[PDB]
C-alpha cells in the first residue's frame, strides 16, 4: 500500500497538541530543549504513540468526576477530580501509556471550562459550568494515577460526585509563575516520579537541518504574551496515517511543500518514520508562505539525502 | 472511476460536525415534525461542501472578528457588538454564495463559550478572555450581514477594535426562554430576510425509513436538561469525502454497520448522495451498538433498494 498524506492545506489543518487551527509553519534551530511531546505522535505507518488519540475534541480534554474541594497554596478555589479514559471507561494505570490518552503534554496553566451534568434526576439532570485552570506542573497533577486538580474563580458551584468534563480553551497566563514551557512534560504520576511509556524524543540528525513545526497561537485568559504551541504533525495527519497504515519503505519520506495555485514547489522537507519533519533552514521563525500550500509525498529517500535549502 | 470509500474510524473515534463534541451514539427519531436542514456537516458523497460547512473541527460554531460597541442589557449582563470576518481572517464578503461565514452556528439557541482577545498593538500584546453567550435567535445575530452580538457576565473587560475569537463550549440554557431548537435555522441576515444558499433539507423518501443521526450531548452552563446535537455525518466523513471526491455512481450508497470483533453486520443503511443516512427503523432513541463498530461501504445501490429492518 502506497504511502500518502492528506491533501489538506495549512488553512485546513488543526494542531495535534491543542484544539487550535494551524496558523503557520515554524522553525527554531537553536532550541536547547529536548523535543518530546506526547500528543500528535504517530509513526508514518500509523502507530499512535505517547498520549495521542484520534479526536480533535480529546486533545487536552479530561473526563471524570469531582470528588471534593481541596486546599491549595495558590489563588482560587481548588477541586480534585478523578479522571477516566475519554470514552468513559476506567483508566487502567497498568496500560503502557504515559497517562490517559488526550492528557496535556506540556507544563503550564491550561485554561478552559469545567462542565457537569448530574447523574441523578421532567426527569432531567441539573447542570453547571465554570471557567477552570489546570496547572500541569502541580504536584496534584497526577493523571497517570487517575486524578487531577483544577482551580476555579467560582467559589462554590461545583458539585461532588458528578460527571465532569474539561473543555480546554487556552492558557491562564504565561507570566513567570505560570511555568509555561511547551517542551517540558508534566510529571504524569506526580512530583519526583519518572514518566513512562513515552513517545521518543525527535531531533534532526543531518547537518544544516532543523525541526519543522506546525504552529498555533494559543488564547490567553489574561496578561501579556503571544504564546504558541508547536506540533510535529497536524491532527489530520495523525488521523490519516492511523487509518492508512501504509508500510514505511525507508526511514525518510521526501515531501514537497507545493502551492496548488501555481503548482510550484516552495521548499522540500524530510518526513521521518517516527512522524516529524526536518528542513534545511538556517533561521528561526515562521515560514512565510500562502496558507493554501500543502505537503505532497514525492518519494521514499534515505538519511543521506540532501535537502534543497529553504 | 475512483472507488467510493468511508473512513474506517469507529464511533468512539468520530466527532460531531455541528458542534465540537465527540459522537456519543447513533440515534433515530421517526416522528420528528421539524424540517431537517442543518447547514454544518453538509457534504455530498462526491465531496462538495454545502451550507456553512468548513473542514476545521475548531471552526464549527466558531467566530472571528472585532468588538465595536458595548451595550448594556436592560435587565442583566452586557452585550457586545462584533463584526465578524471569515475564520481565516479575511473580510467576509456577503455577496459570496454562502448562507453566512463558514462555521456559523446552524441552530437556534443560546450558545455558550469563551470570547478571547489578543491585542494587535504594543513589546507583548495584552490579552483577555471571558465566558460569553451568543443568542442565535436574536435580531442582532446577523452573521450574513457581517455582524453579531454576544453577551458576557463580565461587565467591562472586553476591548473594542481588537482581534476576537469565540470558542464554543456548549449551551447557556435550554429553558423555554432560551429558545433551543437544533432544527430551527438562525435568520442569518435578520428576521425579515430570507436565508440564502442553503444546503437542502433531508428526509427519507421511502416509507418505513427514517433519518439516522450521529448524536452528541452538549454541555450546559446552568439549569436542567440533557441537550443533544444530531449531525448527518461526522466531521471526519466531511473531511474524507472532500479529499476523495470520488464520483457518485448512484443516488445511494449502501453501507453496513459492522462489528470488527466478529466481522458481522449489525444493520445496514442508505447513505444518500447529498450526504445523509436513512435506516429502516420504526422507533426512536439510541441505536444500541458497540462503539468500536463502523460503517463500511458495500455497494452503490438504487433509491428503490429495500433496507433490512433494524
Ligand atoms: C493584560 C491584561 O490582562 C488582564 O487579565 C485583562 O483582564 C486585561 O484586559 C489586560 O488584557
Ligand atoms: C549510503 C551512504 O552514501 C554516502 O555517500 C556514504 O558516504 C556513506 O558511507 C553511505 O555509503
Q: For A214-267, give the secondary structure using H, E and C.
A: EEEECCECEEECCCEEEECCCHHHHHHHHHHCCCCCCCEEEEEEECCCCCCEEE
DSSP 8-state secondary structure symbol assigned to residue B202: B
Instruction: Enter the resolution in angstroms.
Output: 1.9
Contact B219 A115 (CB under 8 A): yes
- On whether any CB of chain B is under 8 Å from the CB of A14, the answer is yes
**Cα-based distances in Å from A41 to A37, A52, A202, B39:** 8, 6, 10, 33
Gapped junctions in chain A, after residues (C–N > 2.5 Å): 121
A59-172 has the same fold as A1-58+173-310: no
Pair A196, A98: CB distance under 8 Å = yes
Pair B278, B211: CB distance under 8 Å = yes
- Helix or strand holding residue A170 (H, E): strand A163-171
Would you kindly state where each structural domain of chain B is located, as residue ranges? 1-59+173-310, 60-172
Q: In whole angstroms, what is the distance from residue A46 CA to residue A275 CA? A: 9
- Choose which residue among A223, A224, A226, A227 to substitute to test ligand 1 binding: the one with the highest number of ligand atoms within 8 A of its C-beta: A223
CA-based nearest residue to A234, from A47, A49, A65, A15: A15
Q: In whole angstroms, what is the distance from residue B220 CA to residue A229 CA? A: 29
Q: In whole angstroms, what is the distance from residue A61 CA to residue A104 CA? A: 8
Pair A55, B15: CB distance under 8 Å = yes
How would CATH label the architecture of A59-172?
Beta Barrel (2.40)
Proximal ligand: closest to the CA of A302: 2
CA dihedral A171, A175, A177, A178 (to 10 degrees): 10
Q: In whole angstroms, what is the distance from residue A225 CA to residue A109 CA? A: 14
Q: In whole angstroms, what is the distance from residue B183 CA to residue A146 CA? A: 39
Rounded to the nearest whole angstrom, what is the distance from the C-alpha of residue B19 to the centroid of ligand 2?
53
User: How many residues belong to chain A?
Assistant: 310
Nearest-Cα distance to chain A for B117, in Å, is: 7
Rounded to the nearest whole angstrom, what is the distance from the C-alpha of residue A87 to the centroid of ligand 1?
36
Q: In this structure, how many other beta carbons lie within 10 angstroms of the beta carbon of residue A80?
A: 18
CA dihedral B39, B41, B47, B52 (to 10 degrees): 40
* Cell numbers placing B222: 446552568
Contact A56 B235 (CB under 8 A): yes
Which ligand 1 atom sits nearest the alpha carbon of residue A222?
5
Structural determination approach: X-ray
* Cell numbers placing A43: 509513526
* Cell numbers placing A211: 525541526
Task: Classify domain B60-172 by CATH number.
Answer: 2.40.30.120
* Cell numbers placing A154: 467560582
- State the number of CA atoms in the 13 A half-sphere of A145 facing the CB: 17
- On whether any CB of chain B is under 8 Å from the CB of A6, the answer is yes
- On whether any CB of chain B is under 8 Å from the CB of A12, the answer is yes
- On whether any CB of chain A is under 8 Å from the CB of B296, the answer is no
Pair A236, A13: CB distance under 8 Å = yes
Grid cell 445501490 — which residue?
A: B301
Specify which residues A299 forms β-bridges with. A254
Task: Classify domain A1-58+173-310 by CATH number.
Answer: 2.40.510.10
- On whether any CB of chain B is under 8 Å from the CB of A62, the answer is no
| CA dihedral for B201, B228, B87, B235, sign (positive or negative) | negative
Grid cell 465595536 — which residue?
A: B68
Q: In whole angstroms, what is the distance from residue B218 CA to residue B22 CA? A: 10
3-class DSSP string for A223-236: EECCCEEEECCCHH
How would CATH label the architecture of B1-59+173-310?
Beta Barrel (2.40)
Contact A239 B56 (CB under 8 A): no
3-class DSSP string for B175-200: CHHHCCECCCCCCCCCCCCCCCCCCC
Amino acid at each position: 500500500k502506497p504511502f500518502t498524506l492528506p491533501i489538506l492545506t495549512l488553512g485546513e489543518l488543526t494542531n495535534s497538541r491543542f484544539p487550535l487551527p494551524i496558523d503557520v509553519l515554524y522553525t527554531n534551530p537553536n532550541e536547547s530543549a529536548i523535543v518530546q511531546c506526547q500528543n500528535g505522535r504517530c509513526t508514518l505507518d500509523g502507530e499512535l504513540q505517547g498520549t495521542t488519540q484520534l479526536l480533535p475534541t480529546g486533545i487536552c480534554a479530561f473526563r471524570g468526576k469531582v470528588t471534593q474541594q481541596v486546599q491549595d497554596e495558590h489563588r482560587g478555589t481548588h477541586w480534585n477530580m478523578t479522571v477516566t479514559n475519554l470514552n468513559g471507561t476506567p483508566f487502567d494505570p497498568t496500560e503502557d501509556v504515559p497517562a490517559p490518552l488526550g492528557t496535556p503534554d506540556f507544563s503550564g496553566q491550561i485554561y478552559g471550562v469545567i462542565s457537569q451534568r448530574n447523574t441523578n434526576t421532567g426527569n432531567l439532570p441539573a447542570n453547571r459550568a465554570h471557567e477552570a485552570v489546570i496547572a500541569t506542573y502541580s504536584p496534584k497533577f497526577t493523571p497517570k494515577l487517575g486524578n487531577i486538580q483544577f482551580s476555579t474563580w467560582e467559589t462554590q458551584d461545583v458539585s461532588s460526585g458528578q460527571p465532569t468534563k474539561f473543555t480546554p480553551v487556552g492558557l491562564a497566563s504565561v507570566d513567570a509563575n505560570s511555568h509555561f514551557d511547551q517542551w517540558t512534560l508534566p510529571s504524569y504520576s506526580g512530583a519526583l516520579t519518572l514518566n513512562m511509556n513515552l513517545a521518543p524524543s525527535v531531533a534532526p540528525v543531518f547537518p544544516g537541518e532543523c525541526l519543522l513545526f506546525f504552529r498555533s497561537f494559543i488564547p490567553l485568559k489574561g496578561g501579556y504574551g503571544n504564546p504558541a504551541i508547536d506540533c510535529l504533525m497536524p491532527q489530520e495527519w495523525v488521523q490519516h496515517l492511523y487509518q492508512e497504515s501504509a508500510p514505511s519503505l525507508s526511514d525518510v519520506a521526501l515531501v514537497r511543500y507545493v502551492n496548488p495555485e501555481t503548482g510550484r514547489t516552495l521548499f522540500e522537507a524530510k518526513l521521518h518514520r517516527n512522524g516529524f519533519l526536518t528542513v534545511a533552514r538556517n533561521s528561526a521563525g515562521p515560514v512565510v508562505a500562502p496558507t493554501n500550500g500543502y505537503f505532497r509525498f514525492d518519494s521514499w529517500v534515505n538519511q543521506f539525502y540532501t535537502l534543497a535549502p529553504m
